[PDB]
Structures are given as C-alpha cells and as structure tokens.
Amino acid sequence: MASLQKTRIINSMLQAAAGKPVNFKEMAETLRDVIDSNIFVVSRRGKLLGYSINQQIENDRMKKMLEDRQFPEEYTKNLFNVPETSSNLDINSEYTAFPVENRDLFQAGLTTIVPIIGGGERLGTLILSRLQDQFNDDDLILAEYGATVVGMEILREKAEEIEEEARSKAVVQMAISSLSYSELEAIEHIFEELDGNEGLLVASKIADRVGITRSVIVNALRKLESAGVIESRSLGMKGTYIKVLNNKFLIELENLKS
Ligand SMILES: CC[C@H](C)[C@H](N)C(=O)O
C-alpha cells in the first residue's frame, strides 16, 4: 500500500484538527514524519507559520530565524518566482533552504520548493529540505497533498477570524441597540468609573455620585448582560461583580461621542 497509508495519515490529522483552531506546528510535524524531511511553512512575506526539524543545523543565523519565526525578506520574496513545484535543488540554488556561508558543510543539501495554493491564490510556500536523500515522485505526492492541505488551513484561519469578528460585532450591536438613551448614558459612566475588562461596583453609590437613577444603571447592566456583553454576580451587601465578555464593546462606546 506504501503511499496510500501516508496520504491517509495526512487526511487523519486534518480531520482531527477540524474543530480546534488551526495549528501549523502540528501540521508541519505530521508532514515531517510522513515525508522524512525538514518542513517550513512560509507566508507570503517570510513569517514561518510553523516548521518541524528532522535533522538539526548548527548555524547560529538559522538558529535565530526559527526563534524569531521569520526568514530573510529577500529569500522569501524570490520564492514567488517559483510557479510550480521545483524539486531537488542543490546547495548552489538561490532557493536552497540551507545556509550559504557553508556550501561545503551541506554539499549533499537537497531542497524542494512547493507552492501553496489556496482558493486559486498563492498563499505561501512549503519548503522541504534534507541531507543526501533525493525527493522521489512518491515523496512529491505527499508534499503536494500536504501543501494543498496546509493551504486549506491558512484560509480557514482567516475564515474563522473574520467570522468571529462578525459574531462579536453582532453582539455589540444587539446591546447598543437595546439600550435607551438614558441607559446608554449610564453605561458610558459605569465603564468610565472603571478602567479594565472587569471589576466591582455598587449602583447605589454610582447613582448619587453622578446623579443618575439606581434604576437605570441597574436596567442598563441587565441589558448588557442579556446581550452577552457582560456577566454579573450579585455580590449582596455590596454591589455586583461585572466582567466584560466583549472587548469590542467598550471601543464601540467611545466611537459615538456626544
Ligand atoms: C533559510 C534561508 C536560507 C538559509 C538561504 N539560502 C540563506 O542563506 O539565507
């Protein structure tokens, strides 16, 4: 079966990872295992989204890149000139994934370059590198399957962010729209009278201070809480603990300013 197993091994990981937010290191690791090579998933601008090392490289600059999660601008920018997979590039390629200062320490340095194509776009580049061993057709299939698969995920990552923002904004709209003029004013205060994402406050105290009805402060909080913008614990003899669940909310409360 040979290749059939490994290809499923990928599929396996992908289907495990649906549900959890995308993880690139884990994806890189899986590829490294099935392919038996160094894996680097590089963004359009050199951000190492994730990477897995199959054989360490004693080179301090290389060592920094992996720490800093970044590859040289020049090096990265030139990868977009690779339109299709370019396989088994020696140590003398501009595109080699091994250090150039030591082209003798890695004579047997083969780098394969595999574009990552998303929704019909070049999302990034999957770089594979190893010492000595050639990248055969059977290896190449697993690189390209892998690339395609990583491309899905890069796209899902954004998909989920923009969807989550959408959801957050909605909440804020729910809340704001539900609030009466006076209540809104009151909220502006309560959030003014603290500075943080959470905190405690007695409405009775706030009422007399700023000259607003206990009543409204109290209904105002009730609406925010029903929207999902916060959660409140009645703290009995003294006030009510208040925890903002929506970051976006308080920013919104500035934007309108009169
Ligand atoms: C990771 C980049 C590699 C090492 C490239 N050949 C360079 O020397 O910058």
Numbering used by the authors: 1 to 258
Authors' account:
In low G + C Gram-positive bacteria, CodY is a global regulatory protein that controls the transcription of numerous genes. CodY from B. subtilis and most other low G + C Gram-positive bacteria is a DNA-binding protein that is activated by the branched-chain amino acids (BCAAs),2 leucine, isoleucine and valine, which may be viewed as signals of the metabolic status of the cell, and GTP, which may signal the energetic status of the cell. CodY from B. subtilis consists of 259 amino acid residues. The structures of full-length CodY from B. subtilis determined here reveal the effector binding domain and the DNA binding domain as discrete entities separated by a helical linker.
In addition, we have solved the structure of a leucine 3 to serine mutant, CodY(L3S), in complex with isoleucine at 3.0 Å resolution in a crystal form containing four molecules per asymmetric unit. Isoleucine was bound to the GAF domains of all four subunits in the CodY(L3S) tetramer. The ligand was almost completely enclosed in a pocket formed by the β2-β3 and β3-β4 segments of the polypeptide. This pocket is distal to the site of the leucine 3 to serine substitution that resides in helix α1 at the N terminus. The ligand carboxylate forms an ion pair with the side chain of Arg-61 and a further polar contact with the main chain amide of Val-100, whereas its amino group forms polar contacts to the main chain carbonyl groups of Thr-96 and Phe-98. The isobutyl side chain of the isoleucine ligand projects into the protein parallel to the β-sheet and is surrounded by the side chains of Met-62, Met-65, Phe-71, Pro-72, Tyr-75, and Pro-99. We conclude that ligand binding is essentially unchanged in CodY(L3S) and that the effects of the leucine 3 to serine mutation on the tertiary structure of the GAF domain are barely discernible. The domain topology of the isoleucine-bound CodY(L3S) tetramer is superficially similar to that of the unliganded wild-type form; however, the packing of the chains is significantly different. Following this superposition, it is apparent that isoleucine binding to CodY(L3S) is associated with displacements in the long α5 helix and a significant separation of the two wHTH domains in the dimer. For the Ile-bound CodY(L3S) structure, where splaying increases the translational and rotational separation of the recognition helices to 34 Å and 45°, a longer DNA recognition sequence of ∼30 bp would be needed.
